[PDB]
């Protein structure tokens, strides 16, 4: 035999501390992020969905930190039924982290790269497809673990030793591997594009997404690299000592509770590193329990053209594009400003192909894209004298989610005067 008795009840109390240390921030950031998304606003474009499902998962895994930790202080407290369901939640919820983290890139891939992008409607569909997916793939982690004996775990007491290898095969490169090859394959491809563009955001971009791998390396690798050498124990490549299992029974412990970090450091490696977001949040921490908040060019412009003078029923149609080469747009909008009024949104576009409307003039105004030229058109039919107002055109970024891209600004001009 080999005994471990002393090692779970040394390491019990620092596993508990920041197993609420992960309770608390992950929940809170967790729950901020869906709320900030879904408050006073919709969804705008694909990443929402995704950023919202990737929270999702996190509160699924969140939530049962609380059930973990009533497990340490009482080891019998849990029985069979829950535990293999509470294992359930575990896994599903950390494989649909993972599948919606590698989709954030590839659909940041397919769209600034190949310039091909996603509508909200498409992006729920697949959302549905991807925890489907991540419960398909979780079946053999839990059907296992569904043991109410001392420890509720493997037990691979029965199962012959080769099936939790073939299981941490599987864990290792559908959890790691894959996941690590594919956004660091996506965000090398999309850095070494925004690196060379013109956007004014070119320097961060690459460094949000530095960010992205490293986070995601410094957090899973030290837990797959002790997989890895349980694993060579168990192909007996390796001699194991009763007291080097022990050794690999608390670096599994500590280095599975870093792990656990990596839910609470999702949101400020997505949406709170955006400046829309930060501003959004900011206004719904005002209401509450927060005080009310109160280069500029040679790079890329905004030309507009189409403005002019027209009796009060004409037709107009405004015309805007990107005077650089910039791949990270994802949408472009309209605005106004009356004299003595303020900015308002007239019309807005996503590259995906949702739209966007003012209660004024929807059923009059129709505004059109185009993803290749970065160019968004605005068809003005049965214009009003109300319609007078500067219009400017107004571009928004991915990954950054900036929309400091403002035009010249054109006049529209409809109550005039006119002769019989």
């Known amino acids: 035999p080999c005994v471990f008795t002393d090692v779970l009840n040394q390491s019990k109390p620092v596993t508990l501390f920041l197993y609420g240390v992960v309770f608390l921030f992950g929940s809170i950031g967790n729950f901020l992020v869906i709320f900030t998304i879904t408050w006073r606003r919709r969804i705008q474009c694909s990443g929402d969905v995704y950023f919202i499902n990737l929270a999702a998962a996190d509160l699924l895994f969140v939530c049962t930190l609380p059930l973990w930790m009533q497990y340490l202080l009482d080891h019998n407290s849990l029985a069979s039924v829950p535990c293999t369901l509470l294992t359930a939640c575990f896994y599903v919820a950390m494989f649909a982290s993972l599948c919606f983290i590698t989709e954030i890139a590839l659909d940041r891939y397919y769209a600034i790269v190949y310039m091909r992008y996603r509508p909200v409607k498409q992006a729920c569909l697949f959302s549905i497809f991807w925890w489907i997916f991540a419960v398909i793939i979780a079946i053999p982690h839990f059907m296992v673990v569904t043991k109410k004996d001392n420890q509720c775990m493997t037990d691979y007491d029965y199962l012959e030793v080769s099936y939790p290898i073939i299981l941490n095969v599987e864990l290792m490169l559908g959890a790691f591997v894959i996941p690590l090859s594919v956004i660091s394959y996506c965000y090398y491809r999309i850095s070494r594009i925004v690196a060379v563009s013109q956007s004014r955001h070119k320097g961060r971009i690459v460094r949000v997404l530095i960010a992205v791998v490293l986070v995601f390396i410094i957090f899973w690798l030290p837990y797959h690299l002790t997989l890895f050498v349980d694993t060579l124990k168990l192909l007996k490549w390796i001699s194991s000592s009763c007291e080097f299992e022990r050794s690999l029974k608390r670096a599994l412990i500590l280095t599975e509770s870093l792990a656990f970090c990596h839910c609470c450091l999702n949101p400020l490696l997505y949406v709170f590193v955006g400046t829309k977001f930060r501003q959004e949040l900011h206004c719904l921490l005002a209401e509450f329990r927060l005080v009310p908040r109160g280069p500029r060019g040679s790079q890329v412009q905004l030309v507009e053209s189409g403005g002019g003078l027209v009796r009060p029923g004409g037709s107009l149609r405004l015309s805007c594009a990107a005077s650089?080469?910039?791949?990270?747009?994802?949408?472009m909008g309209w605005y106004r400003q009356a004299p003595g009024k303020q900015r308002e949104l007239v019309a807005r576009?996503?590259?995906?192909?949702?739209?966007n409307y003012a209660d004024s003039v929807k059923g009059r105004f129709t505004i059109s894209r185009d993803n290749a030229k970065n160019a968004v058109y605005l068809q003005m039919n049965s214009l009003k004298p109300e319609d007078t107002a500067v219009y400017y055109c107004?571009?928004?970024?991915?990954?950054?989610?900036?929309?400091?891209?403002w035009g010249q600004g054109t006049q529209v001009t409809v109550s005039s005067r006119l002769e019989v």
């Open positions: 107004n571009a928004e970024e991915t990954i950054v989610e900036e929309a400091d891209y």
């Open positions: 650089g080469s910039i791949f990270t747009i994802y949408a």
């Open positions: 576009i996503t590259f995906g192909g949702d739209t």
